[PDB]
Ligand binder design. Structure first.
Ligand SMILES: CC(=O)NCCc1ccc(-c2cccc(C(=O)O)c2)cc1
Length: 242
């Protein structure tokens, strides 16, 4: 059911990094990874948490729809794209932490905790500050647990409305061409060691869907582009994409 392919380690070694890629073939119900241990090691979700956070905010009416404008609070932050108004689509695209911190404040501790348990999301532990626990609190999730969560989202099986799930999957849209569609979310965890990057989501083909979750050591922001690059090299090697 689960197969380990250590030859994929070359895609990390060649870039002088270390990490895990996990792939799941939905048609065949078969999983593949370069490192079974790390695939089941739990890390801070960082901005990958914007997927569940979006779902919860939409289902509770904290976010009306993907068009509602979240006005910049006028505080200059060091990421230029954060210093502007956003909707759900652009806030996800630019991983706008302060917008999602306000979502979490409006969701509140109790509803956040219940919903993450309903989602079976990671260790389901929101210990810490309600507006930052996914960055430096107690919540943890593994690459295999990300895939389990994404598969439910894909099939609209999470315990929120179909509409909420459709909107979040729209907001996850990352790439689309005549060969495939990628819906995914990046993450970048720096507040707790080890610093890592995430990329989780799936590849839609004409006749199958491949779910993926990767994380990798990220000692500096210089390597963030390797999250997508390494994943796509694995997808290419496995002939999932051209
Ligand atoms: C204020 C702060 O958060 N500093 C910590 C340093 C930091 C934080 C976030 C990003 C970041 C932002 C948006 C997108 C991406 C990406 O992965 O593409 C990365 C870059 C640097």
């Amino acid at each position: 059911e689960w197969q380990e392919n250590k030859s994929w380690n070359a895609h990390f070694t060649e870039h002088k990094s270390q990490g895990v890629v996990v792939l799941w073939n939905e048609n065949k119900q078969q999983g593949f990874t370069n490192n079974l241990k790390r695939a089941n090691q739990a890390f801070l979700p960082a901005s990958t948490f914007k997927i569940p956070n979006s779902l919860i905010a939409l289902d509770l009416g904290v976010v009306k729809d993907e068009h509602q404008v979240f006005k910049w609070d006028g505080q200059t932050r060091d990421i230029a794209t954060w210093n502007r108004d956003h909707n759900l689509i652009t806030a996800m695209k630019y991983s706008v932490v302060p917008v999602y911190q306000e979502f979490a404040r409006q969701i509140g501790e109790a509803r956040m905790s219940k919903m993450l348990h309903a989602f079976d999301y990671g260790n389901e532990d929101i210990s810490g500050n309600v507006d930052s626990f996914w960055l430096d609190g107690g919540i943890r999730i593994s690459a295999t647990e990300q895939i389990s969560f994404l598969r439910k989202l894909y099939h609209n099986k999470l315990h929120v409305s179909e509409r909420s799930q459709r909107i979040v999957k729209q907001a996850m849209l990352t790439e689309a061409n005549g060969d495939y569609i990628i819906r995914a979310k990046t993450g970048y965890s720096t507040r707790i060691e080890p610093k890592i990057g995430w990329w989780v989501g799936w590849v839609e083909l004409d006749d199958n869907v491949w779910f993926f979750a990767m994380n990798m050591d990220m000692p500096t922001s210089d390597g963030l582009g390797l999250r997508q690059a390494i994943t796509k090299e694995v997808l290419k090697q496995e002939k999932i994409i051209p």
